[PDB]
Amino acid sequence: EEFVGDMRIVNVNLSNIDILKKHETFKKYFDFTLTGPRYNGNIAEFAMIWKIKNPPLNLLGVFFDDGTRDDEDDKYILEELKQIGNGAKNMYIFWQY
Amino acid sequence: RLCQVDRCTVNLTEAKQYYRRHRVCEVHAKASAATVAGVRQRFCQQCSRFHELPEFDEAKRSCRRRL
Ligand SMILES: [Zn+2]
Ligand SMILES: [Zn+2]
Ligand SMILES: [Zn+2]
């Protein structure tokens, strides 16, 4: 398993983003109306809004399951997001195919 | 009158669902202070709610509670 401090990096593969609409855990945090992969600055409904910078082809989103962090569009590429967990126990990275 | 900040006339209808749900616009969610119901408050990042400034240490984005 991949770790940054007490935070586990968890890669999740999905056949499409629509699968997360029925995921008991993730469904409240995604904004399914948004174009391009987002990360969350906090834990609240629809919180995954911050545009990940220069995302790879298949990145669908990032969810930090705890903590708060800097919340800005087109600032952090995926590799940098791994460094701003700030108390998240898991960083879920959602991929297609 | 959807953003909780007194006199904020931002149309939250067209904002992301997060802002519509928490009755705060993007700028007011990030302001170090704003007048909410006549009181200097800050939008707590960790709580997604306005608190009075005494509930924060200095310029911290989240209140003193360690969640
Ligand atoms: Zn909420
Ligand atoms: Zn406002
Ligand atoms: Zn708070």
mmCIF file of C-alpha atoms and ligand atoms in Angstrom:
data_model
loop_
_atom_site.group_PDB
_atom_site.id
_atom_site.type_symbol
_atom_site.label_atom_id
_atom_site.label_comp_id
_atom_site.label_asym_id
_atom_site.label_seq_id
_atom_site.Cartn_x
_atom_site.Cartn_y
_atom_site.Cartn_z
ATOM 1 C CA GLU A 1 0.000 0.000 0.000
ATOM 2 C CA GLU A 2 1.089 3.641 -0.786
ATOM 3 C CA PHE A 3 1.147 6.110 2.219
ATOM 4 C CA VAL A 4 1.968 9.828 2.810
ATOM 5 C CA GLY A 5 2.185 10.086 6.641
ATOM 6 C CA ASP A 6 -0.955 8.481 8.201
ATOM 7 C CA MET A 7 -2.821 8.928 4.835
ATOM 8 C CA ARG A 8 -3.326 5.843 2.585
ATOM 9 C CA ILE A 9 -3.393 6.554 -1.207
ATOM 10 C CA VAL A 10 -6.308 4.414 -2.599
ATOM 11 C CA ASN A 11 -6.619 4.127 -6.426
ATOM 12 C CA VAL A 12 -10.256 3.214 -7.356
ATOM 13 C CA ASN A 13 -11.019 2.011 -10.969
ATOM 14 C CA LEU A 14 -14.598 2.620 -12.297
ATOM 15 C CA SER A 15 -16.236 1.655 -15.645
ATOM 16 C CA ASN A 16 -17.812 5.196 -15.581
ATOM 17 C CA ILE A 17 -18.367 8.076 -13.043
ATOM 18 C CA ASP A 18 -22.132 7.180 -12.887
ATOM 19 C CA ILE A 19 -21.145 4.170 -10.656
ATOM 20 C CA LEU A 20 -20.297 6.705 -7.855
ATOM 21 C CA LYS A 21 -23.912 8.088 -7.990
ATOM 22 C CA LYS A 22 -24.969 4.810 -6.198
ATOM 23 C CA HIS A 23 -21.820 4.475 -3.949
ATOM 24 C CA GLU A 24 -23.117 4.742 -0.303
ATOM 25 C CA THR A 25 -19.840 6.517 0.790
ATOM 26 C CA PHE A 26 -18.904 8.817 -2.158
ATOM 27 C CA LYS A 27 -22.313 9.824 -3.659
ATOM 28 C CA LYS A 28 -22.806 12.891 -1.323
ATOM 29 C CA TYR A 29 -19.344 14.464 -2.070
ATOM 30 C CA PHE A 30 -19.259 14.345 -5.935
ATOM 31 C CA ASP A 31 -20.732 17.132 -8.106
ATOM 32 C CA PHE A 32 -21.802 15.096 -11.180
ATOM 33 C CA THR A 33 -22.646 18.351 -13.127
ATOM 34 C CA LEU A 34 -18.932 19.472 -13.216
ATOM 35 C CA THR A 35 -16.508 19.031 -16.196
ATOM 36 C CA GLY A 36 -12.954 17.813 -15.351
ATOM 37 C CA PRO A 37 -11.697 15.966 -12.240
ATOM 38 C CA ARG A 38 -12.187 17.805 -8.859
ATOM 39 C CA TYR A 39 -10.832 17.455 -5.259
ATOM 40 C CA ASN A 40 -12.539 18.494 -1.965
ATOM 41 C CA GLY A 41 -11.207 21.125 0.492
ATOM 42 C CA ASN A 42 -13.507 19.766 3.263
ATOM 43 C CA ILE A 43 -16.259 17.204 4.167
ATOM 44 C CA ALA A 44 -19.731 18.437 3.028
ATOM 45 C CA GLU A 45 -22.373 17.635 0.355
ATOM 46 C CA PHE A 46 -21.099 18.428 -3.201
ATOM 47 C CA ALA A 47 -17.653 19.470 -1.741
ATOM 48 C CA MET A 48 -15.553 17.976 -4.665
ATOM 49 C CA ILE A 49 -15.364 21.223 -6.733
ATOM 50 C CA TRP A 50 -11.656 22.270 -6.978
ATOM 51 C CA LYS A 51 -10.241 21.691 -10.537
ATOM 52 C CA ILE A 52 -7.146 19.402 -10.386
ATOM 53 C CA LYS A 53 -4.342 21.002 -12.500
ATOM 54 C CA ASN A 54 -3.228 19.245 -15.774
ATOM 55 C CA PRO A 55 -5.085 15.996 -14.915
ATOM 56 C CA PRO A 56 -4.088 12.694 -16.625
ATOM 57 C CA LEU A 57 -6.507 11.395 -19.379
ATOM 58 C CA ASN A 58 -8.448 8.986 -17.044
ATOM 59 C CA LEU A 59 -8.607 10.927 -13.679
ATOM 60 C CA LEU A 60 -12.275 11.329 -12.528
ATOM 61 C CA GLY A 61 -11.710 12.889 -9.057
ATOM 62 C CA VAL A 62 -9.964 12.891 -5.636
ATOM 63 C CA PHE A 63 -11.776 12.585 -2.266
ATOM 64 C CA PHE A 64 -9.923 13.199 1.038
ATOM 65 C CA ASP A 65 -12.048 11.415 3.727
ATOM 66 C CA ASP A 66 -11.062 13.921 6.497
ATOM 67 C CA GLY A 67 -9.280 17.257 7.205
ATOM 68 C CA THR A 68 -9.316 20.592 5.305
ATOM 69 C CA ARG A 69 -6.807 21.953 2.724
ATOM 70 C CA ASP A 70 -6.101 24.841 0.315
ATOM 71 C CA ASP A 71 -9.130 25.038 -2.060
ATOM 72 C CA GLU A 72 -8.279 26.471 -5.542
ATOM 73 C CA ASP A 73 -8.833 25.565 -9.261
ATOM 74 C CA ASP A 74 -5.850 24.693 -11.536
ATOM 75 C CA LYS A 75 -3.243 24.996 -8.677
ATOM 76 C CA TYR A 76 -2.340 21.367 -7.614
ATOM 77 C CA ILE A 77 -1.507 18.499 -10.034
ATOM 78 C CA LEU A 78 -2.343 14.987 -8.644
ATOM 79 C CA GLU A 79 1.225 14.377 -7.264
ATOM 80 C CA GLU A 80 0.978 17.661 -5.196
ATOM 81 C CA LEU A 81 -2.547 16.730 -3.889
ATOM 82 C CA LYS A 82 -0.890 13.682 -2.139
ATOM 83 C CA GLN A 83 1.008 16.235 0.070
ATOM 84 C CA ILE A 84 -2.045 18.239 1.385
ATOM 85 C CA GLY A 85 -4.043 15.472 3.160
ATOM 86 C CA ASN A 86 -3.875 17.459 6.470
ATOM 87 C CA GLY A 87 -5.443 14.641 8.599
ATOM 88 C CA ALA A 88 -7.201 12.655 5.814
ATOM 89 C CA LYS A 89 -6.844 8.890 6.617
ATOM 90 C CA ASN A 90 -7.551 8.014 2.911
ATOM 91 C CA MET A 91 -7.038 9.900 -0.375
ATOM 92 C CA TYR A 92 -9.396 8.120 -2.866
ATOM 93 C CA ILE A 93 -8.174 8.674 -6.483
ATOM 94 C CA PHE A 94 -10.952 7.666 -8.961
ATOM 95 C CA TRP A 95 -9.891 6.422 -12.475
ATOM 96 C CA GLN A 96 -11.825 5.279 -15.641
ATOM 97 C CA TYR A 97 -11.193 1.842 -17.388
ATOM 98 C CA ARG B 1 -31.023 36.948 -0.728
ATOM 99 C CA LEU B 2 -29.553 33.353 -0.864
ATOM 100 C CA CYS B 3 -25.949 34.149 0.311
ATOM 101 C CA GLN B 4 -26.055 34.652 4.142
ATOM 102 C CA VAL B 5 -23.723 37.724 3.933
ATOM 103 C CA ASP B 6 -25.946 40.830 4.492
ATOM 104 C CA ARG B 7 -26.627 42.619 1.131
ATOM 105 C CA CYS B 8 -24.834 39.910 -0.976
ATOM 106 C CA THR B 9 -26.899 39.905 -4.243
ATOM 107 C CA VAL B 10 -24.968 36.982 -5.878
ATOM 108 C CA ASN B 11 -27.489 34.704 -7.704
ATOM 109 C CA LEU B 12 -26.679 31.272 -6.084
ATOM 110 C CA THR B 13 -29.066 29.614 -8.645
ATOM 111 C CA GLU B 14 -26.059 29.659 -11.058
ATOM 112 C CA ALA B 15 -23.414 28.796 -8.375
ATOM 113 C CA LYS B 16 -22.043 25.242 -7.809
ATOM 114 C CA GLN B 17 -24.381 23.008 -5.740
ATOM 115 C CA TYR B 18 -22.009 23.291 -2.711
ATOM 116 C CA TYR B 19 -22.586 27.096 -2.427
ATOM 117 C CA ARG B 20 -26.385 26.835 -3.093
ATOM 118 C CA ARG B 21 -26.654 24.104 -0.350
ATOM 119 C CA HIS B 22 -24.595 26.084 2.266
ATOM 120 C CA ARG B 23 -26.168 29.516 1.370
ATOM 121 C CA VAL B 24 -22.763 31.230 0.756
ATOM 122 C CA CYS B 25 -21.036 32.468 -2.451
ATOM 123 C CA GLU B 26 -17.438 31.512 -3.407
ATOM 124 C CA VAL B 27 -15.843 34.836 -2.254
ATOM 125 C CA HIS B 28 -17.827 35.008 1.045
ATOM 126 C CA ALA B 29 -16.914 31.326 1.813
ATOM 127 C CA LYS B 30 -13.181 32.395 1.727
ATOM 128 C CA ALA B 31 -13.386 35.928 3.270
ATOM 129 C CA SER B 32 -11.455 36.371 6.589
ATOM 130 C CA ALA B 33 -14.615 38.230 7.814
ATOM 131 C CA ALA B 34 -18.128 39.259 6.661
ATOM 132 C CA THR B 35 -21.238 40.793 8.266
ATOM 133 C CA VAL B 36 -23.830 37.976 8.758
ATOM 134 C CA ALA B 37 -27.011 39.047 10.649
ATOM 135 C CA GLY B 38 -25.125 42.239 11.731
ATOM 136 C CA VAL B 39 -22.227 40.220 13.276
ATOM 137 C CA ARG B 40 -18.592 39.821 12.056
ATOM 138 C CA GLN B 41 -18.377 36.102 11.108
ATOM 139 C CA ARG B 42 -16.147 33.771 9.082
ATOM 140 C CA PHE B 43 -17.201 30.762 6.964
ATOM 141 C CA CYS B 44 -15.549 27.768 8.741
ATOM 142 C CA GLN B 45 -13.880 25.506 6.142
ATOM 143 C CA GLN B 46 -14.255 22.348 8.315
ATOM 144 C CA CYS B 47 -17.903 23.052 9.462
ATOM 145 C CA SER B 48 -19.219 24.726 6.220
ATOM 146 C CA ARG B 49 -21.055 27.233 8.502
ATOM 147 C CA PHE B 50 -20.526 30.877 9.615
ATOM 148 C CA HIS B 51 -19.201 31.326 13.194
ATOM 149 C CA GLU B 52 -18.437 34.582 15.129
ATOM 150 C CA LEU B 53 -14.683 35.483 15.001
ATOM 151 C CA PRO B 54 -13.986 34.454 18.678
ATOM 152 C CA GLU B 55 -14.432 30.746 17.597
ATOM 153 C CA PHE B 56 -11.257 30.999 15.401
ATOM 154 C CA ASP B 57 -7.556 31.604 16.292
ATOM 155 C CA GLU B 58 -6.340 34.726 14.353
ATOM 156 C CA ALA B 59 -6.766 34.199 10.538
ATOM 157 C CA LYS B 60 -7.366 30.350 10.660
ATOM 158 C CA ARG B 61 -9.853 29.103 7.969
ATOM 159 C CA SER B 62 -11.411 26.618 10.487
ATOM 160 C CA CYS B 63 -12.570 27.080 14.136
ATOM 161 C CA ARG B 64 -10.637 25.776 17.209
ATOM 162 C CA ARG B 65 -12.445 22.349 17.394
ATOM 163 C CA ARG B 66 -10.003 19.548 16.361
ATOM 164 C CA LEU B 67 -12.287 17.307 14.154
HETATM 165 ZN ZN ZN C 1 -23.883 20.729 4.302
HETATM 166 ZN ZN ZN C 2 -21.957 36.285 -0.911
HETATM 167 ZN ZN ZN C 3 -16.172 25.476 12.560
#
